[PDB]
Amino acid sequence: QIPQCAGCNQHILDKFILKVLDRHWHSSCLKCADCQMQLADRCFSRAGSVYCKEDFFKRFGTKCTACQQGIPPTQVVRKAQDFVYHLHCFACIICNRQLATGDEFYLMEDGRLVCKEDYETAKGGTPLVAGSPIRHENAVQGSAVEVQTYQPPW
Ligand SMILES: [Zn+2]
Ligand SMILES: [Zn+2]
Ligand SMILES: [Zn+2]
Ligand SMILES: [Zn+2]
Numbered sequence: 001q002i003p004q005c006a007g008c009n010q011h012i013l014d015k016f017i018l019k020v021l022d023r024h025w026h027s028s029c030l031k032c033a034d035c036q037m038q039l040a041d042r043c044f045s046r047a048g049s050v051y052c053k054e055d056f057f058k059r060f061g062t063k064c065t066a067c068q069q070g071i072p073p074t075q076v077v078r079k080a081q082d083f084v085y086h087l088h089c090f091a092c093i094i095c096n097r098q099l100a101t102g103d104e105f106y107l108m109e110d111g112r113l114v115c116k117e118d119y120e121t122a123k124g125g126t127p128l129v130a131g132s133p134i135r136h137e138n139a140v141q142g143s144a145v146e147v148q149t150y151q152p153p154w
Contacts, residue, residue: 005029007050019146020045030145034059042142053142062140064089065111076133081126083111084139090130094118103130 002011006020007029018025020043030039034055044056051059061070062077066089071077078090078099091098092105092115099105104116106125119125 015149017148017150019148020050020143024148025145039145041145043145044140044142053137056140056142057137062136066091066113071136073136076135077139079131079134079139080105080107080111080113080128083107085113087133092118094122099130101130101132104128105130 002013003017003024004010005012005026006023007025010026012024012026014026016027018027018030020030027038030043030050031037032039032052032055033049035052037052039050039052042053044051044053046056046060057073061073062084063069064071064086065083066085069086071084071086076087078085078087080090088098091113093112094114095118097115099113099115105128106114106116106119107128108114108125114122114125116127
């Protein structure tokens with residue numbers, strides 16, 4: 001079937017169709033709102049627009065999953081799946097212990113963190129091992145830009 005472009009909402013007739021999550025794009029519509037460069041690599045989406053990494057970061061900050069405060073661009077962060085935290089907010093909600101690199105924990109669906117010991121006692125969460133602190137740059141990844149073609153049978 002012929003998808004409509006998430007950008008311009010027209011049917012995409014190009015042989016190569018771009019896919020960002022489960023939305024389809026014209027390659028000529030998947031351009032940074034700011035600098036107009038084609039997004040070959042990663043797409044950074046916010047509200048009604050899409051950006052390159054540089055122009056996304058120049059413009060937007062990241063909220064901590066836990067405290068909902070801004071994380072300064074000049075500070076490292078912790079990550080569990082897609083969630084981003086201040087180091088001091090990367091802590092068990094039950095015992096309040098700050099998790100260190102390598103610590104075993106469980107991530108609840110909404111981003112709440114539970115140390116292994118407290119989770120298993122209380123017991124669902126996803127089991128994880130705490131990653132090293134990451135630079136604010138490499139924290140938000142954006143979405144991969146995938147490629148598909150029209151192929152028979154149609
Ligand atoms: Zn389009
Ligand atoms: Zn840009
Ligand atoms: Zn925080
Ligand atoms: Zn705990």
